[PDB]
Amino acid sequence: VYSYTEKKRIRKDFGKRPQVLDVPYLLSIQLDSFQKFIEQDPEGQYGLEAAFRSVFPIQSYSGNSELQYVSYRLGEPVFDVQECQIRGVTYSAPLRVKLRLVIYEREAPEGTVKDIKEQEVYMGEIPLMTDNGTFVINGTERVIVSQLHRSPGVFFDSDKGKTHSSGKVLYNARIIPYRGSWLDFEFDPKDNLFVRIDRRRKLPATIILRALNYTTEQILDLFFEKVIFEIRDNKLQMELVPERLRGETASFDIEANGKVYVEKGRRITARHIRQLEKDDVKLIEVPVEYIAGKVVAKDYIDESTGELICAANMELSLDLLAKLSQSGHKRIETLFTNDLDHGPYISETLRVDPTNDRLSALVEIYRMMRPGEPPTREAAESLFENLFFSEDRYDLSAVGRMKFNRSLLREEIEGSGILSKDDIIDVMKKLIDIRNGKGEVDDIDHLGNRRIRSVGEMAENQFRVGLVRVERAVKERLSLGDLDTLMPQDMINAKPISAAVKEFFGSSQLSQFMDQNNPLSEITHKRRISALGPGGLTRERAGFEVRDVHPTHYGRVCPIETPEGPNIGLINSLSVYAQTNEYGFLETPYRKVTDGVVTDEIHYLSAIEEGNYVIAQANSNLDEEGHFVEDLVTCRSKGESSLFSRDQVDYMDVSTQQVVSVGASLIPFLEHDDANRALMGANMQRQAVPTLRADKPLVGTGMERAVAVDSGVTAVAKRGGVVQYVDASRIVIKVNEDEMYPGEAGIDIYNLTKYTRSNQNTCINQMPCVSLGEPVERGDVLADGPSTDLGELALGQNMRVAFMPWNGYNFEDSILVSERVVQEDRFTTIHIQELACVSRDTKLGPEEITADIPNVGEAALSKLDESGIVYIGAEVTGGDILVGKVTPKGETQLTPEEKLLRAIFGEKASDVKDSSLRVPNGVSGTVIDVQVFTRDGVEKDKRALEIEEMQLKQAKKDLSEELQILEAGLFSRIRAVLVAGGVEAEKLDKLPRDRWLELGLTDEEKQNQLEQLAEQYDELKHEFEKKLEAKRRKITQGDDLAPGVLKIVKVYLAVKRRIQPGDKMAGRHGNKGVISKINPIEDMPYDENGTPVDIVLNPLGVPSRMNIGQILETHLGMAAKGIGDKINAMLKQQQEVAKLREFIQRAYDLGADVRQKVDLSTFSDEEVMRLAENLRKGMPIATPVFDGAKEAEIKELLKLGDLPTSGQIRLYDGRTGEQFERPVTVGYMYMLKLNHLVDDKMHARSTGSYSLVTQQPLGGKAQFGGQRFGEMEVWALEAYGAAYTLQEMLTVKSDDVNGRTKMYKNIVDGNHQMEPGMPESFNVLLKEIRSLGINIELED
């Protein structure tokens, strides 16, 4: 079950859980989101259609000039993606709106349609997403990180603790709609519900109940239960309920029929309730003093003269009990309250409600909302009925209304978009019950409260904003009834809409530079989930509920992969299987568990519904039919996992990588690392700069291939076929005839990207991993980009590390790297800087790029060509002139004796100043490119035409090669059609090939296909013609530079950094350390066989930093290279494919019950020698994250090689040749080279530039500015008595403008002594204080 190019290097997969659901498209979020956005589906689906349906049509305010929306279209980009990268312009698509404007010439009837104007107006260019879910916004490549913001709905938060300083938890609910006013129901330290509409004063909570036309009686009927008293011949007997008298204190002796159950003072038992039900007692006799404190339920009036004996919410008393018995009342209904569970809150909040009836409720709401205005009946009722109950203003969106219904345990998933009295009452009910103990508040760091945005939603929102601005402006224009003389083009702008979407995609906190020193960086920065930016919390505000990881993250956000440091827990990253709901919530798949068998149908559960079900565990065996083998299985029900019955589970997890992200899936042995260690490991792995040539992990987790293919660096097949021509630049694929369309014969052709600078200046380029005439299949890798080997992500190199001290050279976390590691060039990296020389137009005159530069030797201009620019390929070192340029400078007013020294030697003073672009200090790399842009209508120099002539020749010669490829394929298909029915055997190939498009055949549908092929060939000829013409016209156009510049000369340099002391290397388990020496090979701790270890690592970093994963991977890598050494020996002392096949088949089974059934008998004998060659340097080994190889498997694989089972070797000192006591761990560990390169960290300065306003060291060489001698260092030098050090550190070396130039003389004069003076910081401060009215002077 392995493809042809999949027995090249098969990874021996450990891991026993079969895979039920293959890893989805990793970049699915970005891609399908924008496909949602830039999409023509005329319905309720979001996108641009939604924006235009919302804002249009527009109408005059009874002036009746309707400007309505007809349709729209996406105009194709005027520049390719790569030309947008080169020429410094975003990659957009003009957005045409077929708009229509009917003039409602209104007389009758009711404004009939009079005349119409349809026009296609242009409103902004919307940036587009490339094939890899990324944008090109100014030539730089950017990514719109998805945002995770709270949703419309109702949330019950407590605000426990610090509030009120009495310890008492508060409880407030909030209805936050998509658009409208908030609505808060806040408890208070004295328990009575309040209200607070947006942030106004806290009205009571019964005022809104009254505003809904609820009188007191049915309000108390809503929020309470009822206790019934009646005079059944003994003084208002009680209508007793069994359950309600639980956990109470006996207020009296509750007895029945002579049966004594409750003695007062005797607190109620549960035995008491069990017996009160076992006797079925409902009507009892009680003291008359019990009804004293309680509260009536309805306004009890008398009928003698309508005597208001008692109204609702009026507590009784024995006097009112007498007044109630005297008027002959039997029913006495009271609020059943109790301070434990049925707390009285509505009662007290009515007793504090200063209002009594509805209209006063409205008027107090009005005085709250819009104060000062005298309120009235009509305006108040209108305000209330247009607060939340009018679709004009309020909007609980579908997201919000779904959340609202689901939060109150409703079954209707979609209702109105406006609040109902039922809805508000139910919110208050649920809030009171959350106060009662029935339920507990939601955690606002829930993943069920926060929904996810994306680039296809935030762009659309910015578009709606621009549309609303332009619609208001169009209303303003149309209100002035000019005439029929205009169609909807002059009334519509483009600066507003274009400016809105531009200021989104170009300067936002969610539109970031794409990380590019990896496949992993790109593909894991397109999957980020930020909580910053617009519409979400911020590092300032947040916060510690948000930094944290809630139980709902399982399968939705990686809990171990987050950028630690300042914003940790604010940039959480998606997991592998996590999709987004239709509403924006994050779903993860679970295999449905039927009666007892795990069905293979997966349900994508959201984060809100996931708590109801008993979701089982992925580490769960199965009886080969979906049957759990254990008695009770471990599941997780509502946050907390536990043992649950086998025939109780509703779901099982899909795989065990379901919880770790794409980054934290490439860590072998994640199970064995301390979680913070895996966090630092994923973060550091996300920076491993590519090396000169890639190298597969000797110990992987199988996810490298998915990550590399899902990324875009790899070039992979669109259709299977035979590789007809390979090359460093391009691959050509004669398509398999089965996968070929009917017409347009064709053969695929992939032009690889050779050397080019990433966003981090590291190198991007692709190598063909397929040879001439090699069968490719669809979805297969033909070009392995940077950091990938045969389509497997390879950030590092597997180095032979020995865990041992070695003389202090790895003291804290240093790494002692041998010199064979820098000899063999297995950490050299290629770095592509770009320098640029712009020739602006100063007032004194435009500058020039002449190679006649003043005051320079004839060696300095050796490398420059005739026009000034450097040659291509000129090896350069720091200081050399890349682009000689001279600026106009005249005059200068030379001084005295310099005057005499120019009058003596007669060397004139040149009227030009030297400002040429020279290589930085320290950089030393070949100039691999030169690009010259010019202002339009400015004479191109001699060497700006040596580029365009060569570029036109290359373009036409490439569109010639491609048309020869395509015509070769078409003629091959034509010949194949003439294999029968028109077959000329041996001079058909001799005939003119142009005399093939209409050759004589049996004129059946075969001739139809041949006419297809001929017409395809002619269309191809014309297509290549106009391709070359448009390419020429684009190459020979004047580039558009920013104003003031004439020509920009860009020079791309390709330095080759080599690993050296100072540079920072790291394993994948978060074991960082800067390599702090390069040892001779003869000093490395070698073994009895003679081989030196390559790297030496401190043992002591394992126990403290609890990451056993790194030593486990040392052992397993030693095993995997030991199974490769045997194969290599067998392959050099040639045995034959039989015995080699035998050993590989042994090494490939080698474990417990694993799903890596591989048998080397379905392999052609030369298919086993390609494999046997690619396993020569060690066999790869897969190890899924929490499904890895167990230690017994490691020992067995060691024993299969001839290594020691203990994982440890005896090693001899390289220098003294003696043997280390206590054998050492030595194994092959995968080591990454982060780009915290020392060649960038190291800088220094003595005297350079200075700032203009605050004359302090500025620098600007990145960074020639000195070091910031901050405040803590001032205290450190006051701690010593170092007064002179401090003084010179803040006056002579920093600020004092005379003292510093005066001391640079004294240093050179052999005199180490300064005259400090007074810092220009203090002179400026004096000038500023004095520039107030404050006279500040210096008393002599």
């Binding site: 083009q489 310099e898 306003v1253």
Partner: protein, 154 residues
Amino acid sequence: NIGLMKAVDKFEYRRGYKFSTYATWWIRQAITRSIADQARTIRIPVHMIETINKLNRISRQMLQEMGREPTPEELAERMLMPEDKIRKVLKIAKEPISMETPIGDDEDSHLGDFIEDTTLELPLDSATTESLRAATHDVLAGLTAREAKVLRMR
């Protein structure tokens, strides 16, 4: 208000014209005048503001029509200017960015911290002038008072 006093002293009942339509004439005049005068730090005169305004008004038009964007070639086409003073006009229109712009850096840095100094002479270039003064005083000392005095004086 100042233009209103101006028009009130120049309002006439003899045409029988209502006050507002004419005082608003004078008021729009004076208000646009003071806008063009004191709304920009680097004062361009009022005619330059009118020229940049007509350039902008022919820019939105040429954008909505020609699809892509105006250009100095296109604008010198549609407008009656010589293709180069339009260059300098569109160079002139932009506002000085504030020197307290919050830069996109770590230290809360601003745009005023990176503006280097092009007038200062580097202390290698003052100690390369005092060395020259000493050298010339030496080489002149190797000379008669005739040459020395006449060269220090010339």
